[PDB]
């Protein structure tokens, strides 16, 4: 096997850059699921499900006002030995809310 | 004062982009240092003592003396330190450069 292993973030703004971050976890998932993120198994397995494709997780019955307050997501580090790194933003709580999955959980 | 989470990476090659990854692990320091990283408590303090620069972590040290062949390894550290975004890398020349700058951060 190769490593798995990330660091995510949740913080207020439009891009990672420039996001106040708020809360980060740490996520392991090779050989084994373990880190700080709160569901280190469930995000580790919902993860593999979607080949590492954290856009796939993060993508809009959700019914959403269009308010503009917005808060970034990160993933960076490597999944299955590739060197990655993602940002998403969301347009306001209640977007997050339904975008965040297992993964963004936290 | 606020999170400090972090993934590094050791690979073959000269620089991130273009070296693979061998081995990762995970840091984290607040409140209590834990991780993969096989000594979390001796690398957060490190890296606190050092007010989280990696470059001093990585700095040159008065009683190095390595040949000079070129067979590189690249050192990475990725995600905040206290609440601030972290993005480095450091390429050391061969393996007795990694072994004089690794110190305890990229001892794993």
Same mark, same amino acid.
């Given at each position: 096997?190769?490593? #798995? &292993? =990330?660091? =995510?973030?949740? /913080?207020?703004?439009?891009?990672?850059? #420039?996001?106040?971050? @708020?809360?980060?976890?740490? =996520? +392991?998932?090779?050989?084994?699921? #373990?880190? *700080?993120?709160?569901? !280190?198994?469930?995000?580790?397995? @919902? =993860?593999? &499900?979607?080949?590492? +494709?954290?856009?796939? $997780?993060?993508? $809009?019955?959700?019914?959403?006002?269009?308010?503009? +307050?917005?808060?970034?997501?990160? !993933?960076?580090?490597?999944?299955?030995?590739?060197?990655?790194?993602?940002?998403? *933003?969301? !347009? +306001?709580?209640?977007?997050?809310?339904? /975008?965040?999955?297992?993964?963004?959980?936290?």
């Amino acid at each position: 096997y190769a490593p #798995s &292993a =990330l660091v =995510l973030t949740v /913080g207020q703004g439009d891009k990672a850059a #420039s996001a106040g971050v @708020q809360r980060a976890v740490t =996520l +392991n998932c090779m050989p084994k699921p #373990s880190g *700080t993120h709160p569901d !280190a198994r469930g995000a580790c397995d @919902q =993860l593999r &499900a979607a080949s590492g +494709n954290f856009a796939e $997780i993060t993508k $809009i019955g959700t019914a959403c006002t269009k308010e503009w +307050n917005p808060f970034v997501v990160t !993933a960076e580090g490597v999944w299955e030995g590739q060197r990655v790194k993602y940002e998403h *933003t969301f !347009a +306001n709580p209640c977007e997050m809310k339904a /975008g965040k999955g297992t993964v963004f959980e936290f």
